[PDB]
Amino acid sequence: VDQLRLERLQI
Amino acid sequence: VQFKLVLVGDGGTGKTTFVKRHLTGEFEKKYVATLGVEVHPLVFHTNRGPIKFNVWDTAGQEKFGGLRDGYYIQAQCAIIMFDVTSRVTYKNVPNWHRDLVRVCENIPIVLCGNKVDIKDRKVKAKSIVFHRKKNLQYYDISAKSNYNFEKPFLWLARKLIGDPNLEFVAMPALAPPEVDPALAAQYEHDLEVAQTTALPDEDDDL
Amino acid sequence: GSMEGILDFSNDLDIALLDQVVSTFYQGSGVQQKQAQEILTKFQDNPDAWQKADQILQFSTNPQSKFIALSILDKLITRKWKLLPNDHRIGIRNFVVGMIISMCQDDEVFKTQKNLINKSDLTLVQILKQEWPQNWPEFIPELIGSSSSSVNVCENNMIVLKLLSEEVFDFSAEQMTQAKALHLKNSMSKEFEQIFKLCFQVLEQGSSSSLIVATLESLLRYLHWIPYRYIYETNILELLSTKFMTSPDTRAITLKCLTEVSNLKIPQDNDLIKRQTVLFFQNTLQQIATSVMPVTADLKATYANANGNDQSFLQDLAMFLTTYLARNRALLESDESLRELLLNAHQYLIQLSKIEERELFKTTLDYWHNLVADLFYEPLKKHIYEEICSQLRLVIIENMVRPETIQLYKSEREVLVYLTHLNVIDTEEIMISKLARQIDGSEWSWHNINTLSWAIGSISGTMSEDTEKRFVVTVIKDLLGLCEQKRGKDNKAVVASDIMYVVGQYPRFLKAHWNFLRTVILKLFEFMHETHEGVQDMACDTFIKIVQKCKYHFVIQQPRESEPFIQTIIRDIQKTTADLQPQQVHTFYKACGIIISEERSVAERNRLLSDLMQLPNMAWDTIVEQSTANPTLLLDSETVKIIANIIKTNVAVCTSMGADFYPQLGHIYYNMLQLYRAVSSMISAQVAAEGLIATKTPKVRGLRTIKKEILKLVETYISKARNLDDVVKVLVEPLLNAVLEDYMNNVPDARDAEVLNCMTTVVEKVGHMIPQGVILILQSVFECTLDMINKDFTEYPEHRVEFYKLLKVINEKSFAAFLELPPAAFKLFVDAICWAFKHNNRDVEVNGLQIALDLVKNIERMGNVPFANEFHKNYFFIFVSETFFVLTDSDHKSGFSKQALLLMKLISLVYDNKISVPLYQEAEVPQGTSNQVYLSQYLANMLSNAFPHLTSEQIASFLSALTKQCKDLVVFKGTLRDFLVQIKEVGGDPTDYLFAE
Amino acid sequence: IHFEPVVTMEEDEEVLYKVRAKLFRFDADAKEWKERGTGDCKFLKNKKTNKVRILMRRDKTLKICANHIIAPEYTLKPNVGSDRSWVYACTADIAEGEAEAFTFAIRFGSKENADKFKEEFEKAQEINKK
Ligand SMILES: Nc1nc2c(ncn2[C@@H]2O[C@H](COP(=O)(O)OP(=O)(O)NP(=O)(O)O)[C@@H](O)[C@H]2O)c(=O)[nH]1
Ligand SMILES: [Mg+2]
């Protein structure tokens, strides 16, 4: 799960 | 290129308000019962040219019914209207449909559940099934919020013209004219009154 | 003008003038048309116009004129038939019979005037309903005989029989008495053997398509009521399911007949019947496959093309397939030789479910729900349908509608959840593959990624937690890469939103992966600074939704963190919400209150609460200090908006915290009520200085917003309060002192209906504890609000609704307040209840009927005391007669059930001698007359004057039945509806009221 | 080898301003405002004449509910009941046919949309002065 890098999600 | 459309349903369901909205853009808050019928021409511009509906807006209150099913003769399409805040108006849909198709045996018919803008809806979507076996098109509509207000006419235009891809299009917009001191004092009077009459529904999003 | 000549009945009717008026109405336009219409209506509404109908029908050359003539006759037959001299009855019958025969015999007329003939047939049927069979025993035999001598007559007789069946079995319930409906049903049933013989002979032998179609249309009506033996012991199923499915002329009606056949009452233990039920389905599906379209055909495209009657046909096929299979598919499930038939039928339904037509999709979806629920519970069935279910997964996923179309999404979710349990592996595979074609761009579109995201979100909770975990990871990994790959905030916004949508749908996953849940929230907080349209709403909506489901994880201290995450949210709330609109800030605070209410240590919860409210409380203190030192500020729109938003923030937090909100309420309560008063006098001063128009200005609307939000805050808290002692001893008296006089002493256009609503909640929660307070509420709002609403049914609509809600709860919880009313004011209370009866507005009418019922009960409970006895003397017959009035006046049909209940309670009081005094006056009847006898007498006289065309016998029989039946609401209601039928005509049969007996 | 292959009147104008709005007309005989349409209100600058008009169409049906020059003599006034509307007399609107005079009111989603409309409205008057 931590492998998901959701903090990088950008608009 | 005109088609006769009869509009039927219980008193107070919004038939006349719906037509008025389409004719002038206005929303009439008052309930003035139709007496017998009122006939209004209504033109829509489409990618297949203009289509004219001759709308026979009939009375829903029995004591004002006038000629009743006499109004349906030679209709080419119809709208049956009920009020989703009043179950009785849905219970009566089969009665209006019966009287209608006895005169008009094979015409496109739209069933409209009006007033969906009201939070406390009484005729639940799941309850609305009468159109299935009768091959009627159904739409939730609101003459007040304009929700789906064009769908009945678009669907009928498609059936009447026989083109499933018919679309409403923008009527051409002619250049307006450029344009008297003798009426400078009279237009100022109408303006004072207009300024000091509050606009309605000031809480609406528009 | 000239057209009005037909209205002068002292002259002979100029038939050519009639035809001109009729033409101008039907074929004319504008002003001419409208004048003709008003004339025609006056003509047909003349009570003597029926006398001139035989002229019109003989000598008019205009079919519209004859149609109107028949409408006139219809009114007479329907309402006044039994008053006619018997010679006119026979004459009218003979005229109508002869006219139909003659129209049938002229082939040109028969083909060109279907509308006029159909109207004549219906008029004939009205006469049958009056005369047949008792006065016309030969009608059916002579109909059958005449049918053999002419195809046209035979076809028209099918129309007559169709209409008769409709009038007797489909539309009789609300238009006839129970006794008369039964009489006609029995009469038709008695002679249906002969009718069926003719119908079956025509179907077996006939060749005229038009005659066949008419016969099948009448069969459709018969199937609503006839015994199943006429369908199963004849060869008629064979004909329906083969011969008549081949020609499109008969196909539509035949399919509708077979759908109703699929609904007959059949014994379910007979093997012959079962094979017959299988067989007609097998025949029908074979005819469709060979004569209409194969199962592989693209019904989506066919429907879209909308050729001829294809759309109605596919609609009717969906109805047939779903109706039959919902009932009979078990018949096809065990025999290997029926397996192909079972799956072909379902494959047609698959193809039908791809049609773009919302209402048809709902019809097929209801069936799919029926199927997959059964496969989920019923042993050894799901394997049969594996390939159907796999296709259905794709159909549902690809037509998923927006959840947040409410009803359709829930139905789709339900089916897809079942389909996931049935094969979880197949469901995952379809969704992953679908996501790949979003990434490879082959099915990429804003719409398509949205619907797939909804579908993925919809099956949350169906997978095991382990499988859910790597499914969610895969989905989010893919969605994150998709967002990376797109350009422009347009596309990136859409994909980031769907990511947050999916996340918000899997709280189980969030609750197990704290670090991930933290990352989500911090990303949402980031998005609350993004001004691209929609992002901030999406961010706030996702925040509160996640909070509602995972609040516990924000209120505990998570391992590896220094503090519960709610503390971290509160510390940074100013920066987090800096760019949000007020409405969005309030949602944010509401979400924080949800979390804070999970803290059950009181000192910690209260500290969190006071910390959450730090910003609004500091803004509040400042304005209270300022605005009190200078009331002028409150005209500064900027200060008014600030104030309203502070109070709305309190409402939002109080909404999620309820009883826990009390400490914050105490911080602001006393100054808030002082603010209420200051704003109140500012509103009054503006209306004094500018007039009523002031209430429309932005300044005053802003000021009233403050008042309304204060009332809503107090209502919200009190509705959820757990310590009612504090409500009574701390909150109520300051509240009443602040709001009641202000309401009473403002002009009508400045009174806030919200005051009534707030008072309704006060009475509800603590009314039993504040009897003097309830009296004070009534004194301050009752008469002045009643005077606002008792001049029409339209003005002050909100005050109207709230007024009767307040009286209802006062009558429920503190009826003693009405006892203390001075007698003139109690009379106003009674008038107010009856006034409510007469509204068509359901909101008011229902409460008015309930108040009336509750009031009677309250009086009954008092026993035999002077107030109760005076109540009956003063008001019993007022309630009886006002209830009867709205029952019988045809403008209050929506309240029938509650009117009947009230009337039944009223009558039962008298017939149980629960009224201890005479209801009559001194010397109005002999001493010792029972109230029962007086009630019957009063009602007989009331109905006689109100309905003078009823016979005394009708009235007496109606009342005898109604009285006997006052313990049986169902039967009582039947008798009321029988009375409503009889008052619409002359000469109703008084023995009808013995139906129940 | 050649294979034969298979077989509004706003176009001459520039859009200067566009805003969502609800338009009312005053029925002096009924002493009440009546809605005429809700949709996009556009300021359209003719390429050939540089004359700017208001053109407004109803949603869905696209029927014209306003079509008139933004004359320099017109004056936007506040309505007593709204901080997000303007009232003005119009001498010649052709939305429904023959040029008719009207007292219009136009309301917007926000006070600042209303103020901006006013800004653009007056810029457009300057252009029409020439
Ligand atoms: N909230 C809401 N009210 C509506 C809507 N449509 C109509 N109304 C209101 O319902 C009431 C009745 O409208 P009306 O058009 O006269 O109904 P009608 O069907 O023509 N009645 P009749 O058959 O007697 O002529 C009016 O007050 C109208 O403003 C709607 O969509 N929403
Ligand atoms: Mg009407």
Author numbering:
A (entry chain D): 427 to 437
B (entry chain A): 9 to 187, 190 to 216
C (entry chain C): -1 to 376, 414 to 439, 461 to 1053
D (entry chain B): 63 to 69, 78 to 200
Q: What do the authors of the reporting publication say about this deposited model?
A:
Because most previously studied NESs have substantial helical content, we also study five NESs that match class 2 (Ф1XФ2XXФ3XФ4) and class 1b (Ф1XXФ2XXФ3XФ4) patterns, where the hydrophobic residue positions do not suggest an amphipathic helix. The previous structure of RevNES (class 2) suggested that its three prolines may constrain against a helical conformation. Class 2 NESs in the Mothers against decapentaplegic homolog 4 protein (SMAD4NES: 133YERVVSPGIDLSGLTLQ149) and the fragile X mental retardation protein (FMRPNES: 423YLKEVDQLRLERLQI437) have few to no prolines but still bind CRM1 with mostly loop-like structures. Class 1-R NESs are strand-helix peptides, class 2 NESs are mostly loop-like and class 3 NESs are all-helix peptides. (A–E) FMRPNES (light orange), SMAD4NES (salmon), HDACNES (slate), PaxNES (pale cyan) and FMRP-1bNES (deep teal) bound to the ScCRM1 groove. (C) Detailed view of niche motifs in (+) NESs, FMRPNES and mDia2NES. In all (+) NESs, main chain carbonyls of Φ2+1 and Φ3 residues in the 1-turn helix element hydrogen bonds with the ScCRM1 Lys579 (or MmCRM1/HsCRM1 Lys568) side chain, much like niche3/4 motifs where carbonyls of residues i and i + 2 or i + 3 coordinate a cationic group.
